[PDB]
Amino acid sequence: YTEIPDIFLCPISKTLIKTPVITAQGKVYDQEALSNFLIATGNKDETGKKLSIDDVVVFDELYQQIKVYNFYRKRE
Ligand SMILES: [Cl-]
Numbered sequence: 001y002t003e004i005p006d007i008f009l010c011p012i013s014k015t016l017i018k019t020p021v022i023t024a025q026g027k028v029y030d031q032e033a034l035s036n037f038l039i040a041t042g043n044k045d046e047t048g049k050k051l052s053i054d055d056v057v058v059f060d061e062l063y064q065q066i067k068v069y070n071f072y073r074k075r076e
Contacts, residue, residue: 008066011046012037017066020059023051028059 010017013033021031027045035053038045045051 005069007062008069010034017062020062020066021056022059022062023056028062029056031056031058 004016007028008017009015010030010033011027013030017028017030017033019031020028021034022028023045034045034056038051038053041048043050043052
């Protein structure tokens, strides 16, 4: 599997997450992808529900796991 682990996938950018943010609903996106996407739809997420970039936090644990993935990845 050269493929990116699914938990590190952003539903919007559809690749690797650079910085995980998590919604109150518990959904995980890449920060910059979500920000920009939410501007395009006008605070609606990819299933058309209301969402603001102000109501997300960085997902610290997962950010950390991503850094480790990145170590193993960029090794090859
Ligand atoms: Cl996790």
